[PDB]
Design an enzyme around this catalytic site. Structure first.
Site, PDB file in Angstrom:
ATOM      1  N   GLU A 227       1.079   0.858  -2.870  1.00  0.00           N
ATOM      2  CA  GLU A 227       0.970  -0.497  -2.351  1.00  0.00           C
ATOM      3  C   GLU A 227       2.277  -0.913  -1.689  1.00  0.00           C
ATOM      4  O   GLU A 227       3.366  -0.482  -2.081  1.00  0.00           O
ATOM      5  CB  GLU A 227       0.608  -1.467  -3.479  1.00  0.00           C
ATOM      6  CG  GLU A 227       0.404  -2.920  -3.048  1.00  0.00           C
ATOM      7  CD  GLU A 227      -0.903  -3.132  -2.304  1.00  0.00           C
ATOM      8  OE1 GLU A 227      -1.897  -3.550  -2.936  1.00  0.00           O
ATOM      9  OE2 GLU A 227      -0.930  -2.891  -1.079  1.00  0.00           O
TER      10      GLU A 227
ATOM     11  N   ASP B 134      -2.813   1.813  -6.075  1.00  0.00           N
ATOM     12  CA  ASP B 134      -1.510   1.161  -6.035  1.00  0.00           C
ATOM     13  C   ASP B 134      -0.365   2.101  -6.376  1.00  0.00           C
ATOM     14  O   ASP B 134       0.697   2.026  -5.750  1.00  0.00           O
ATOM     15  CB  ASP B 134      -1.486  -0.035  -6.992  1.00  0.00           C
ATOM     16  CG  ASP B 134      -2.370  -1.173  -6.524  1.00  0.00           C
ATOM     17  OD1 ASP B 134      -2.404  -1.437  -5.304  1.00  0.00           O
ATOM     18  OD2 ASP B 134      -3.030  -1.804  -7.376  1.00  0.00           O
TER      19      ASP B 134
ATOM     20  N   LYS C 171     -13.537  -4.434 -10.782  1.00  0.00           N
ATOM     21  CA  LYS C 171     -12.710  -3.355 -10.254  1.00  0.00           C
ATOM     22  C   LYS C 171     -13.275  -1.984 -10.604  1.00  0.00           C
ATOM     23  O   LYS C 171     -13.059  -1.020  -9.863  1.00  0.00           O
ATOM     24  CB  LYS C 171     -11.278  -3.486 -10.775  1.00  0.00           C
TER      25      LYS C 171
HETATM   26  O1  LIG Z   1      -4.717  -2.917  -2.130  1.00  0.00           O
HETATM   27  C1  LIG Z   1      -5.434  -3.910  -2.015  1.00  0.00           C
HETATM   28  N1  LIG Z   1      -5.926  -4.312  -0.830  1.00  0.00           N
HETATM   29  C2  LIG Z   1      -5.610  -3.652   0.423  1.00  0.00           C
HETATM   30  C3  LIG Z   1      -6.393  -4.299   1.582  1.00  0.00           C
HETATM   31  C4  LIG Z   1      -5.536  -5.489   1.925  1.00  0.00           C
HETATM   32  C5  LIG Z   1      -5.873  -6.672   2.567  1.00  0.00           C
HETATM   33  C6  LIG Z   1      -4.888  -7.625   2.767  1.00  0.00           C
HETATM   34  C7  LIG Z   1      -3.594  -7.403   2.337  1.00  0.00           C
HETATM   35  C8  LIG Z   1      -3.252  -6.223   1.699  1.00  0.00           C
HETATM   36  C9  LIG Z   1      -4.237  -5.268   1.488  1.00  0.00           C
HETATM   37  C10 LIG Z   1      -4.147  -3.915   0.836  1.00  0.00           C
HETATM   38  C11 LIG Z   1      -5.827  -4.741  -3.203  1.00  0.00           C
HETATM   39  N2  LIG Z   1      -6.701  -5.737  -2.990  1.00  0.00           N
HETATM   40  C12 LIG Z   1      -7.083  -6.504  -4.014  1.00  0.00           C
HETATM   41  C13 LIG Z   1      -8.075  -7.612  -3.735  1.00  0.00           C
HETATM   42  C14 LIG Z   1      -9.388  -7.397  -4.500  1.00  0.00           C
HETATM   43  C15 LIG Z   1      -9.996  -6.245  -3.713  1.00  0.00           C
HETATM   44  C16 LIG Z   1      -9.784  -6.688  -2.279  1.00  0.00           C
HETATM   45  N3  LIG Z   1      -8.601  -7.558  -2.361  1.00  0.00           N
HETATM   46  C17 LIG Z   1      -8.110  -8.279  -1.340  1.00  0.00           C
HETATM   47  O2  LIG Z   1      -8.219  -7.886  -0.182  1.00  0.00           O
HETATM   48  C18 LIG Z   1      -7.404  -9.585  -1.642  1.00  0.00           C
HETATM   49  S1  LIG Z   1      -5.611  -9.541  -1.368  1.00  0.00           S
HETATM   50  C19 LIG Z   1      -4.953  -9.316  -2.991  1.00  0.00           C
HETATM   51  C20 LIG Z   1      -5.320 -10.187  -4.017  1.00  0.00           C
HETATM   52  C21 LIG Z   1      -4.807 -10.010  -5.289  1.00  0.00           C
HETATM   53  C22 LIG Z   1      -3.936  -8.976  -5.547  1.00  0.00           C
HETATM   54  C23 LIG Z   1      -3.565  -8.106  -4.544  1.00  0.00           C
HETATM   55  C24 LIG Z   1      -4.074  -8.279  -3.272  1.00  0.00           C
HETATM   56 CL1  LIG Z   1      -3.593  -7.175  -2.028  1.00  0.00          CL
HETATM   57  N4  LIG Z   1      -6.594  -6.279  -5.273  1.00  0.00           N
HETATM   58  C25 LIG Z   1      -5.696  -5.263  -5.527  1.00  0.00           C
HETATM   59  O3  LIG Z   1      -5.273  -5.093  -6.681  1.00  0.00           O
HETATM   60  C26 LIG Z   1      -5.315  -4.480  -4.440  1.00  0.00           C
HETATM   61  O4  LIG Z   1      -4.439  -3.497  -4.695  1.00  0.00           O
HETATM   62 MN   LIG Z   2      -4.197  -3.532  -7.001  1.00  0.00          MN
HETATM   63 MN   LIG Z   3      -3.607  -1.963  -3.653  1.00  0.00          MN
END
Ligand SMILES: O=C(NC1Cc2ccccc2C1)c1nc([C@@H]2CCCN2C(=O)CSc2ccccc2Cl)[nH]c(=O)c1O
Ligand SMILES: [Mn+2]
Ligand SMILES: [Mn+2]
Length: 180
Positions: free
Chosen positions: A65, A93, A119
């Site tokens: 990440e 991550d 998840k």
């Molecule tokens: O890697 C992730 N998403 C990709 C894609 C993406 C998109 C925008 C910005 C960054 C990223 C990287 C990721 N997404 C999530 C969450 C729920 C599943 C979809 N989601 C989101 O899109 C919401 S944003 C977010 C919210 C809370 C924690 C962290 C994040 Cl990033 N929860 C994780 O724990 C995780 O690791």
């Molecule tokens: Mn995550």
């Molecule tokens: Mn992630």
């Protein structure tokens, strides 16, 4: 259109975290200026990922990440071909070089049980390890294996409740909790 939550995120988290969160949001076509609650969530999740990787030994964890999405994949195939682990459908991550598994970190403002299920159904990939943290101190991990020792995990939980308190002191907590 500058919000209070945006300026709080800029003041609450260190600049390297904010910059990585900013680039990540725009990379996925979303604006931190208006999606300010999500802006806080990414910074929070990012800081937990870094604290997590600092909880092990010197070079135990590989951080996925925060990387650009192409390079974040690049390191995954390298890891997969190096250790012979199935390439996940979703970007994880972390990677635990000691336990030889990918880790998906979760940070939640709701019930820890339900978010894990969400998840787990979304991953559907039994290989990757799942570790959920809550803004009130509950943690849940795959097979009750919490990877790090208690001290490292307690540090993460402490910072989460500090972020909660600081948001509440500025009346931004209620909006943040309802946004997820
Ligand atoms: O890697 C992730 N998403 C990709 C894609 C993406 C998109 C925008 C910005 C960054 C990223 C990287 C990721 N997404 C999530 C969450 C729920 C599943 C979809 N989601 C989101 O899109 C919401 S944003 C977010 C919210 C809370 C924690 C962290 C994040 Cl990033 N929860 C994780 O724990 C995780 O690791
Ligand atoms: Mn995550
Ligand atoms: Mn992630």
């Amino acid at each position: 259109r500058g919000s209070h939550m945006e300026d709080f995120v800029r003041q609450c988290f260190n600049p390297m975290i904010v910059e990585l969160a900013e680039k990540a949001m725009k990379e996925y076509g979303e604006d931190p200026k208006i999606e300010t609650n999500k802006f806080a969530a990414i910074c929070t999740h990012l800081e937990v990922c870094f604290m997590y990787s600092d909880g092990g030994s010197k070079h135990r964890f590989e951080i996925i990440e925060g990387r650009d999405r192409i390079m974040a994949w690049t390191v995954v195939n390298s890891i997969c071909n190096t250790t012979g682990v199935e390439k996940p459908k979703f970007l994880p991550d972390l990677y635990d070089y000691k336990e030889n598994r990918f880790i998906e970190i979760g940070v939640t403002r709701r019930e820890v049980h339900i978010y894990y299920l969400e998840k787990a159904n979304k991953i559907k990939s039994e290989k990757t390890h799942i570790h959920i943290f809550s803004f009130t101190g509950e943690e849940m991990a795959t097979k009750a294996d919490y990877t790090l020792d208690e001290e490292s995990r307690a540090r993460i939980k402490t910072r989460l409740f500090t972020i909660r308190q600081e948001m509440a002191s500025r009346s931004l907590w209620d909006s943040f909790r309802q946004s997820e």
